[PDB]
């Protein structure tokens with residue numbers, strides 16, 4: 625299958641409640657580590673990140689944040705102050721899909737303006753929203769200093785393989801849901817709610833629906849997927865039965881199992 | 882209005898006296914500064930653990946504060962969400 629290595633930054637300079645930089649980062653599903661400006665060292669977010677992973681990963685990850693900080697956040701911080709930009713969201717990801725071809729991007733959702741989709745194979749940044757000196761300003765950060773783009777494209781995929789191997793166990797676990805069906809008290813918006821509750825399932829890929837006489841009821845379909853605490857997933861499907869016999873309704877659920 | 886969607890839920894079905902996890906999750910909130918407070922019986926539950934602020938590919942932010950508790954008969958659990966000056970209180974529900 626495909627596998628993406630994501631690092632999810634949040635830049636909020638002079639924000640009184642938030643720190644300057646948060647980091648996240650997740651092997652697919654699995655959040656694998658976390659850094660922010662107060663902590664002064666990355667912390668891992670899975671046991672197996674803390675055990676099946678070389679130390680030499682963390683000293684160089686540690687350097688990597690500086691790069692984004694020093695080659696990017698510093699250089700535009702003057703700009704954002706001028707535009708009254710309150711915060712910026714930065715997604716840096718590389719993906720290795722069925723080993724056909726490899727994509728590494730870097731995106732920046734400048735708050736208020738759009739996103740800057742920087743493609744790091746072609747080394748060219750496009751505007752996905754409001755156009756501004758930033759789209760090319762970061763193109764030229766990335767065009768010069770090619771050593772830095774050597775941390776965001778090629779080490780990204782080697783680090784993917786590293787962590788992909790450390791996490792192969794985790795990403796392959798199969799938590800099995802429990803499909804539960806409750807009649808929910810008559811709320812303000814549906815008169816007779818029917819909930820199908822599917823909780824603890826690890827492969828996020830899942831196919832569930834409500835059916836009436838086999839026919840798939842899609843009228844009052846409300847569908848939520850919430851995170852659990854142990855890296856599995858929760859799913860709720862609500863329908864207003866509208867005073868139809870509830871014995872005629874069924875919640876068909878296909879999980880990999 | 883950038884206002885959080887918040888759900889308050891339990892990991893597994895409440896079975897009284899049987900350990901569980903109490904979960905308050907907020908997503909879809911525009912100003913990213915948010916407070917999440919787990920409430921037992923109107924009181925703030927200590928030693929609760931929070932995920933880290935982060936977002937989805939669609940840039941929408943996310944927070945999840947949770948804690949291992951044991952549901953007991955009589956007991957009630959909720960979540961104070963303080964977002965953007967306001968506190969709102971969601972009960973298990």
Ligand SMILES: *[C@@H]1O[C@H](CO)[C@@H](O)[C@H](O)[C@H]1NC(C)=O
Pocket residue numbers: 928
């Ligand atoms: C908080 O939770 C941890 C779970 O690892 C527990 O072992 C600890 O005793 C608790 N109390 C604290 C940290 O005061």
